[PDB]
Design an enzyme around this catalytic site. Structure first.
Site, PDB file in Angstrom:
ATOM      1  N   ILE A 266      -0.887  -5.571   9.544  1.00  0.00           N
ATOM      2  CA  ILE A 266      -2.195  -5.249   8.978  1.00  0.00           C
ATOM      3  C   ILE A 266      -2.913  -6.521   8.539  1.00  0.00           C
ATOM      4  CG2 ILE A 266      -3.296  -4.171   6.988  1.00  0.00           C
ATOM      5  CD1 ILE A 266      -1.071  -1.933   7.329  1.00  0.00           C
ATOM      6  N   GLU A 267      -2.199  -7.422   7.860  1.00  0.00           N
ATOM      7  CA  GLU A 267      -2.878  -8.559   7.244  1.00  0.00           C
ATOM      8  C   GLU A 267      -3.245  -9.643   8.254  1.00  0.00           C
ATOM      9  OE1 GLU A 267       0.219  -7.675   6.608  1.00  0.00           O
ATOM     10  OE2 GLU A 267       1.548  -9.400   6.883  1.00  0.00           O
ATOM     11  N   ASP A 277      -3.393  -0.667   1.712  1.00  0.00           N
ATOM     12  CA  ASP A 277      -2.221  -0.955   0.892  1.00  0.00           C
ATOM     13  C   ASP A 277      -1.516   0.375   0.648  1.00  0.00           C
ATOM     14  OD1 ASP A 277      -0.428  -1.296  -1.263  1.00  0.00           O
ATOM     15  OD2 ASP A 277      -2.048  -1.493  -2.720  1.00  0.00           O
ATOM     16  N   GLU A 295       3.382  -2.862  -0.144  1.00  0.00           N
ATOM     17  CA  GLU A 295       2.408  -3.147  -1.194  1.00  0.00           C
ATOM     18  C   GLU A 295       2.780  -4.411  -1.959  1.00  0.00           C
ATOM     19  OE1 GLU A 295       1.907  -0.430  -4.724  1.00  0.00           O
ATOM     20  OE2 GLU A 295      -0.194  -1.039  -4.486  1.00  0.00           O
ATOM     21  N   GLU A 296       4.045  -4.525  -2.355  1.00  0.00           N
ATOM     22  CA  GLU A 296       4.457  -5.671  -3.156  1.00  0.00           C
ATOM     23  C   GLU A 296       4.300  -6.968  -2.377  1.00  0.00           C
ATOM     24  OE1 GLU A 296       6.422  -2.868  -2.818  1.00  0.00           O
ATOM     25  OE2 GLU A 296       6.674  -2.095  -4.856  1.00  0.00           O
ATOM     26  N   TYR A 335      11.268  -8.207   4.975  1.00  0.00           N
ATOM     27  CA  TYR A 335      10.881  -7.293   3.908  1.00  0.00           C
ATOM     28  C   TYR A 335      12.125  -6.869   3.144  1.00  0.00           C
ATOM     29  CZ  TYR A 335      12.708  -3.497   6.802  1.00  0.00           C
ATOM     30  OH  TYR A 335      13.518  -2.676   7.552  1.00  0.00           O
ATOM     31  N   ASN A 408       2.289   3.442   8.890  1.00  0.00           N
ATOM     32  CA  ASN A 408       3.059   4.582   8.392  1.00  0.00           C
ATOM     33  C   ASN A 408       2.998   4.706   6.868  1.00  0.00           C
ATOM     34  OD1 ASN A 408       3.814   5.015  11.075  1.00  0.00           O
ATOM     35  ND2 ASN A 408       5.851   4.109  10.828  1.00  0.00           N
ATOM     36  N   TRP A 409       1.815   5.034   6.371  1.00  0.00           N
ATOM     37  CA  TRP A 409       1.569   5.242   4.953  1.00  0.00           C
ATOM     38  C   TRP A 409       2.454   6.337   4.364  1.00  0.00           C
ATOM     39  CZ3 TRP A 409      -2.568   9.067   3.292  1.00  0.00           C
ATOM     40  CH2 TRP A 409      -2.777   9.005   1.911  1.00  0.00           C
ATOM     41  N   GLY A 412       9.150   5.964   4.967  1.00  0.00           N
ATOM     42  CA  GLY A 412      10.241   5.274   4.305  1.00  0.00           C
ATOM     43  C   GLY A 412      10.590   5.967   2.995  1.00  0.00           C
TER      44      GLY A 412
HETATM   45  C1  LIG Z   1       1.970  -1.617   9.486  1.00  0.00           C
HETATM   46  N1  LIG Z   1       2.855  -2.376   8.505  1.00  0.00           N
HETATM   47  C2  LIG Z   1       3.979  -1.722   7.926  1.00  0.00           C
HETATM   48  O1  LIG Z   1       4.224  -0.556   8.199  1.00  0.00           O
HETATM   49  C3  LIG Z   1       4.747  -2.547   7.028  1.00  0.00           C
HETATM   50  N2  LIG Z   1       5.889  -2.241   6.295  1.00  0.00           N
HETATM   51  C4  LIG Z   1       6.242  -3.374   5.586  1.00  0.00           C
HETATM   52  S1  LIG Z   1       7.642  -3.447   4.498  1.00  0.00           S
HETATM   53  C5  LIG Z   1       8.435  -1.738   4.355  1.00  0.00           C
HETATM   54  C6  LIG Z   1       9.984  -1.704   4.184  1.00  0.00           C
HETATM   55  N3  LIG Z   1      10.524  -0.541   3.306  1.00  0.00           N
HETATM   56  C7  LIG Z   1      11.916  -0.768   2.879  1.00  0.00           C
HETATM   57  C8  LIG Z   1      12.591   0.375   2.118  1.00  0.00           C
HETATM   58  C9  LIG Z   1      12.629   1.640   2.957  1.00  0.00           C
HETATM   59  C10 LIG Z   1      13.073   2.857   2.032  1.00  0.00           C
HETATM   60  O2  LIG Z   1      13.573   2.568   0.921  1.00  0.00           O
HETATM   61  O3  LIG Z   1      12.883   4.016   2.463  1.00  0.00           O
HETATM   62  C11 LIG Z   1      11.299   1.952   3.621  1.00  0.00           C
HETATM   63  C12 LIG Z   1      10.488   0.727   4.122  1.00  0.00           C
HETATM   64  N4  LIG Z   1       5.379  -4.406   5.831  1.00  0.00           N
HETATM   65  C13 LIG Z   1       4.449  -3.888   6.727  1.00  0.00           C
HETATM   66  N5  LIG Z   1       3.352  -4.499   7.301  1.00  0.00           N
HETATM   67  C14 LIG Z   1       3.021  -5.930   7.015  1.00  0.00           C
HETATM   68  C15 LIG Z   1       2.539  -3.754   8.210  1.00  0.00           C
HETATM   69  O4  LIG Z   1       1.569  -4.299   8.723  1.00  0.00           O
END
Ligand SMILES: Cn1c(=O)c2[nH]c(SCCN3CCC(C(=O)O)CC3)nc2n(C)c1=O
EC number: 3.2.1.143
Length: 498
Positions: A266-267, A277, A295-296, A335, A408-409, A412
């Site tokens: 996204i960024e 976010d 988000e973090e 991440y 995927n808002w 997870g």
């Molecule tokens: C389109 N998009 C994303 O989808 C995206 N996700 C992330 S980090 C998400 C890791 N998180 C860990 C714990 C898990 C749980 O505990 O269930 C679930 C997921 N950075 C992203 N960026 C930069 C981006 O552009």
């Protein structure tokens, strides 16, 4: 194929798609903390007013430098005495912060700060930290009454209000958050501010996660940059709360365009687009504590986002927070457990006529589902639709709206179904008359599935309401009296082809 649908080159982006901005001016719904008549490209903005004005009440940030910040002695005088000491060892910094936080000396752990300084950094990096970076952070923090001269209103629930402030003002406030100087923001059993996120950084200092060193490297990169050379731009924080929400079952709007891809972020690849976010209702989530997900990470590489936590009340179901102008200071990889600070980032974004970086981020919080099937309940689907719609709507012509860059808002950890949440965002973007750029973050099958559904629905000219009614049928036929026997997308294909 790495991407499907409309080429991303055909999607609208800022600044090229934007309308001429009106003159920046304070008003009943827009707080402006700088001299607009003196705003000039490449010049540090001048605070307005010239001399500090204080408000200590339930509608404004309680500033650490307020004469009403007492303990009666002056807490601001105490902060000054505590922070204007040489640091040579991490215990010195802990002791300093605790001199004006005595009530928390048994409650706050500094293990991660001590470990970072003593056990992660090499000698020369530690020396630079305590000889240059921390003293420079103290100086910009202690300069607060000369930098943030105008009271900062709380963006409280149901308020439709904006704050525009300088990046330099944000740096001074974030230096104060680092040193944990904001009063009334600490007690676990607080009444005042219980509906606001944490702002002081004390939980960044606790425990032994391998994450905290990476978070600290990312933040110290920012602090080193903005104390060495003041940033010259502005940032706007807008709380938006809608009352009129679509009758989704009766919406005759067609779907808009889709670019979906399993590569990119996204960024980086959504430059100039409305960047989602994946937020917590307390904006920023666990950025100042243990969280390190989408988000973090964004709040760490664009730390000016973090200051939204100083004044943004927890979001209600009909609200979002829109932040325009934050600058990227760091690059990263991974991440969560694999997140690592990579290097300093030089932001190349153009600035708009208000000297804001052409970067617009919207915090919308998805629901957390205890049970997977809970999210197909019509009230929960409508909630998510209205949340995304509020985040996407700009009460502005469609031709002047950038595409939404999202993914995927709420999946997870929050248990969202990616295929449902993708369709919900597509419908909300359609109602707001915006195109969608969707990043599946390595999931090629999901990319294909979203593309296939989108072109299936558009080729058959199904409206937003047509699709929403199919979601209601899926709930009724496969979820209410039920995981389900048939998945959502197969159900839709079958219902329409039947
Ligand atoms: C389109 N998009 C994303 O989808 C995206 N996700 C992330 S980090 C998400 C890791 N998180 C860990 C714990 C898990 C749980 O505990 O269930 C679930 C997921 N950075 C992203 N960026 C930069 C981006 O552009």
């Amino acid at each position: 194929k790495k991407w499907l649908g409309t080429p991303i080159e055909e999607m609208r982006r800022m600044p090229r798609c934007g309308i001429r901005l009106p003159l920046l001016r304070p008003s009943a719904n827009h707080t402006v903390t700088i001299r607009v008549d003196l705003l000039r490209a490449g010049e540090v903005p001048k605070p307005f007013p010239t001399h500090y004005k204080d408000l200590w009440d339930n509608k404004h940030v309680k500033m650490p430098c307020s004469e009403q910040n007492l303990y009666a002695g002056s807490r601001w005088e105490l902060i000054q005495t505590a922070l204007l000491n040489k640091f040579t060892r991490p215990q010195n910094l802990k002791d300093a912060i605790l001199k004006y936080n005595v009530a928390y000396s048994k409650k706050w752990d500094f293990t991660a700060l001590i470990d970072f300084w003593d056990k992660v950094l090499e000698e020369a990096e530690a020396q630079h930290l305590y000889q240059s970076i921390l003293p420079d952070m103290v100086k910009i923090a202690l300069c607060l009454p000369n930098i943030c001269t105008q009271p900062i209103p709380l963006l409280a629930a149901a308020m439709n209000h904006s704050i525009t402030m300088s990046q330099e003002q944000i740096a001074s406030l974030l230096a104060n958050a680092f040193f944990c100087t904001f009063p009334r923001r600490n007690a676990k059993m607080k009444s005042e501010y219980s509906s606001y996120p944490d702002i002081n950084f004390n939980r960044l200092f606790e425990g032994r996660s391998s994450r905290k060193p990476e978070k600290l490297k990312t933040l110290f990169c920012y602090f080193r940059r903005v104390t060495a050379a003041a940033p010259t731009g502005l940032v706007t924080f807008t709380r938006q709360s809608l009352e009129d929400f679509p009758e989704w079952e009766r919406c005759e709007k067609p779907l808009t365009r889709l670019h979906v891809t399993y590569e990119g972020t996204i960024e980086e690849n959504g430059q100039g687009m409305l960047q989602v976010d994946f937020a917590n209702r307390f904006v920023g989530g666990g950025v100042t504590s243990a969280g390190l997900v989408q988000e973090e990470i964004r709040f760490l590489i664009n730390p000016e986002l973090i200051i939204s936590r100083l004044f943004t009340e927890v979001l209600d179901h009909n609200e979002c927070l829109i932040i325009t102008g934050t600058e990227q200071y760091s690059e990263y990889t991974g991440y969560a457990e694999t997140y690592r600070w990579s290097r300093s980032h030089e932001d190349g974004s153009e600035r708009d006529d208000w000297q804001r970086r052409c970067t617009e981020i919207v915090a919308i919080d998805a629901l957390h589902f205890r049970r997977y099937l809970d999210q197909f309940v019509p009230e929960k689907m409508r909630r998510e639709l209205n949340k995304a719609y509020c985040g996407f709507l700009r009460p502005v012509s469609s031709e002047n709206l950038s595409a939404v860059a999202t993914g995927n808002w709420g999946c997870g950890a929050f248990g969202g179904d990616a295929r449902l949440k993708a369709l919900i965002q597509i419908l909300a973007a359609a109602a707001a008359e915006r195109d969608v750029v969707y990043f599946t973050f390595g999931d090629s099958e999901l990319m294909r599935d979203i593309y296939s559904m989108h072109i299936f629905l558009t080729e058959r000219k199904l409206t937003v309401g047509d699709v929403y009614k199919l979601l209601l049928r899926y709930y009724n036929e496969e979820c209410r009296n039920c995981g389900p026997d048939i998945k959502l997308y197969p159900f839709i294909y079958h219902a329409v082809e039947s």
